[PDB]
Write a structure and sequence with these properties.
1 chains; 54 residues; mainly beta; two-stranded antiparallel ribbon; 2 strands; DNA-binding
Amino acid sequence: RNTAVACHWIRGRDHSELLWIVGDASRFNAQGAVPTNRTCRDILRKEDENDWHS
DNA sequence: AAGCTTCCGACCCTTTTTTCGGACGATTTAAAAAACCCTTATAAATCAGCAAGTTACGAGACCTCGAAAAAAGAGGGTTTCTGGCGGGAAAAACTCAAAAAACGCTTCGAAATCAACCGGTTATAGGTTTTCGGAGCTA
């Protein structure tokens, strides 16, 4: 459950892509990037504004 | 003489190592404080077993919190067991057809027959014993 390995393929010239991930996919995003900082503080205060547009 | 390229000195900034100083701890030494000894006849403690009254120490219990262990829950993965669907081959129904084969007409006269009872025939249900086929096994 702790395994998190990402494999990137350089297609040559200007392009590269993500082939596969082994283990916890949540440690990477779709393009294979990794978050740089993590917090449990309540950033992104969704509670403040609501969708009742009318 | 000019442009390009390469060293070199000067400097700026931060990190890494060394040195020095300071502080703290430990030990040693010296000084100060508490204590010990020497004089006491008289006053108070020693103690004998048991009664009568009291409690300082032990045991029991519960709570409280914190941590540890275990169990559960989650997620990663692989192996296999089953079900559904698709595809090719064989079977058998379905469709098309002929050629027999039966049936009817239709037989007056020739068998067929049932009945009970005896002895005799023999197909074979059932059981008993046994080759053939396959088990794979092993390099």
